């Protein structure tokens, strides 16, 4: 028999936190808990690596704020993970274009009850024309701000919650932190506690379909080596994002809430060198926002540099990687030269590099913390159902509602 | 998001060898060549690993014979890969049944003129008790021989070509060798040659569908991170096994061949320890064949032990692994103890272990099979060990590659 009292599908931060709240409850004593994830490691969109075995880099989530994410900060402290300052909170090379929009967003601000539901592009193109609003929006380096899908009110929220651009609004006093050893250290800590309390992990299995089976459920899964597996459980939490809920047979979203749901792709590229050649330019711990395809360029101490893009520009770099490594590195070299106002020859070739593309990097909200299927009583858990859609903090908030909803299914 | 004159899907030993034959031909000067594979490394069912950083193990193919496999032997020499003696060619500790094995099999062999194409379990059970047949057959450790789809004729060929049991049909003349650094060194040798001649690799991309498009073909591919990709080519080789052919939209096997194909699952588990405890029993470089679910147990010098199963026993171990690593390892200790005749508590715990399950480890033909195929309509060529006399061996992949390169070069010329 492959069975369990409680089953959680998804071992990101949401699924693992669900598991930990449940095992804390006296009402779960003597119940068995099983956790599935289609990946071979837990963590989901938290993915830490060593670049050339020298320094730790974040391929997914990278930074947090005590002002915006107090539950995440508390989790770091509870599991004895050390934080370090995240330096990329100002631009040394602020333009008047950047300066204008600060003032532009302040003056346009009251028109947001009037027009706040139209797109951010349509909104801003009233101050001056359309051409002028394109130059202002581009200077913030997040291309998702150009989507029709993103409203003016949504964009003011995005802008004010990101460290590179937060001073454009009046959130210039928020502080930002990174993990010394990488956020995978927090994931490992939660996983270890969950295992020590008796939960059993089955990594490398993908859920394909769910069917109600009297008072319980039957799950069909597929291992990454082809092995088919059936699992029966009495209580089910689906701790996966909306994009993955839609791939099941569970009538998502109509049977779960009114909303529709959307997502953005994200791309990050990291490069190391034989010598930290940007110290002469005094670029260490600085971020440059530029119009060319790198968009946002970061220099991390004397260790490495990287760039970060979303939406159409993320898809641009992923297609460029597919056409060959050679041209990819040569394209980066050209755009590093433009951004620094020098020639191509002054920029060395790298020793090593690494990149990551996330087809559904941010999944958002277009609404209670966690969801229930009206008929079957399955619970859904994701950062996209919260006010912190797009952030680890949202995963923690959804997990605590979701584990609450399930504790009342068990005591009913 | 581009194109090529020639495309190869499949970077196993078949696909890489196809590319090597093509790039060697004068007829491909100036032609561009693109290679796709859904894994992030080349090799296919050849998978070498460094287990606990002290010894190299084979999770897929592991042995070859110069007498049975001359082309594979020549390939090893061409790329300067060094070989070493493979020890598991005799049973030092035979059971009673295993000693009767060769004489029973020698006496039964003439009756294969009448009851030839019969299932091998039936054949052997017609001339002894069926209870006595089950005992004879299982003493050889390959559970494929109990399958209704395996004739008595196929079984005699399987027994005679495997090093642990070849002595049962007087094929001891065959020597066996393994690779000194792993067969991944052969694979890296061909890959570097093909790359140095200008071929381009796209690993991590899975072919989902192909359609004719005037001149050539349009391919839909999915990266292992979601990125969809469309690729255009004028000449196409699918160097993938029949199980993977079936998942496409190419009418396999109807539009390709008059045969049918099956497969067997395979499973291997490797274990290392703080101390080579099996030396006390003189088990180093020896293989035991047992009735219990380990079936075939191997002791590699003083470095590690492993076990190898197929068919229902391979699925048995894979199901065991799904229920948890702890129950798996305790199950292994129980069966090691009964194999050696001692109590559970004298078998140590392992430092490290690794296992691999192949859902379609062996693919073969059920029915004068040509070594490569061609689509009746579209001119796509298929390449695989399964289309040869040597189905289930790397030597078949080398043979199939030669024929596929020829078919493709005749369509490129003219
Ligand atoms: C590039 C990038 C940068 C980011 N930076 C930050 C940041 O700086 N600060 C911040 O707060 N957040 C950041 N995030 C977001 C953060 O990563 C997410 O908000 C959070 O990790 C989501 O947690 P989750 O557990 O809800 O979902 P996930 O991390 O997505 O985990 C979901 C899990 O469910 C599994 N799964 C899915 N489907 C199925 C199925 N059918 N069967 C089985 N298993 C399945 C998946 O494998 C996955 O592990 C970033 C994200 C990206 C992509
Ligand atoms: C456990 C085990 C032990 C073995 N031991 C031996 C031995 O000792 N001696 C011996 O000679 N042979 C042995 N073999 C067999 C040997 O591994 C194979 O015969 C040979 O390697 C197969 O070569 P191939 O290139 O034709 O196919 P494969 O190795 O199977 O290569 C096929 C490739 O195509 C890829 N692919 C498939 N489908 C698709 C798709 N839709 N899109 C994209 N890409 C795709 C796969 O990822 C794979 O890389 C063993 C096999 C196994 C499983
Ligand atoms: N805030 C995360 C990801 C993200 C959330 N919302 C976004 C909107 C647009 C682009 C990225 C995001 C980051 O630091 O990158
Ligand atoms: N030759 C491979 C695989 C194989 C070929 N024919 C087989 C029949 C049964 C089991 C495995 C095989 C091995 O001996 O391991
Ligand atoms: Mg999760
Ligand atoms: Mg191949």
JSON list of C-alpha atoms and ligand atoms in Angstrom, two decimals, chain A residues 8-18 36-37 43-45 238-241 381-382, ligand 5:
[
{"chain": "A", "resi": 8, "resn": "UNK", "atom": "CA", "xyz": [1.22, 17.60, 0.29]},
{"chain": "A", "resi": 9, "resn": "UNK", "atom": "CA", "xyz": [2.22, 17.98, -3.37]},
{"chain": "A", "resi": 10, "resn": "UNK", "atom": "CA", "xyz": [4.93, 20.63, -3.69]},
{"chain": "A", "resi": 11, "resn": "UNK", "atom": "CA", "xyz": [8.10, 21.08, -1.62]},
{"chain": "A", "resi": 12, "resn": "UNK", "atom": "CA", "xyz": [8.75, 24.75, -2.22]},
{"chain": "A", "resi": 13, "resn": "UNK", "atom": "CA", "xyz": [8.67, 27.08, 0.75]},
{"chain": "A", "resi": 14, "resn": "UNK", "atom": "CA", "xyz": [4.84, 26.90, 0.80]},
{"chain": "A", "resi": 15, "resn": "UNK", "atom": "CA", "xyz": [4.54, 23.10, 0.91]},
{"chain": "A", "resi": 16, "resn": "UNK", "atom": "CA", "xyz": [7.32, 22.75, 3.47]},
{"chain": "A", "resi": 17, "resn": "UNK", "atom": "CA", "xyz": [5.81, 25.40, 5.75]},
{"chain": "A", "resi": 18, "resn": "UNK", "atom": "CA", "xyz": [2.41, 23.68, 5.48]},
{"chain": "A", "resi": 36, "resn": "UNK", "atom": "CA", "xyz": [5.75, 14.78, -3.34]},
{"chain": "A", "resi": 37, "resn": "UNK", "atom": "CA", "xyz": [7.74, 17.09, -5.61]},
{"chain": "A", "resi": 43, "resn": "UNK", "atom": "CA", "xyz": [13.11, 24.53, -2.77]},
{"chain": "A", "resi": 44, "resn": "UNK", "atom": "CA", "xyz": [11.07, 25.27, -5.90]},
{"chain": "A", "resi": 45, "resn": "UNK", "atom": "CA", "xyz": [11.97, 28.75, -7.13]},
{"chain": "A", "resi": 238, "resn": "UNK", "atom": "CA", "xyz": [-1.74, 21.21, -3.56]},
{"chain": "A", "resi": 239, "resn": "UNK", "atom": "CA", "xyz": [1.13, 23.61, -2.78]},
{"chain": "A", "resi": 240, "resn": "UNK", "atom": "CA", "xyz": [1.82, 24.50, -6.41]},
{"chain": "A", "resi": 241, "resn": "UNK", "atom": "CA", "xyz": [1.40, 27.74, -8.40]},
{"chain": "A", "resi": 381, "resn": "UNK", "atom": "CA", "xyz": [-1.52, 26.90, -1.52]},
{"chain": "A", "resi": 382, "resn": "UNK", "atom": "CA", "xyz": [0.59, 29.51, -3.33]},
{"chain": "C", "resi": 5, "resn": "LIG", "atom": "MG1", "xyz": [5.25, 24.39, -2.49]}
]
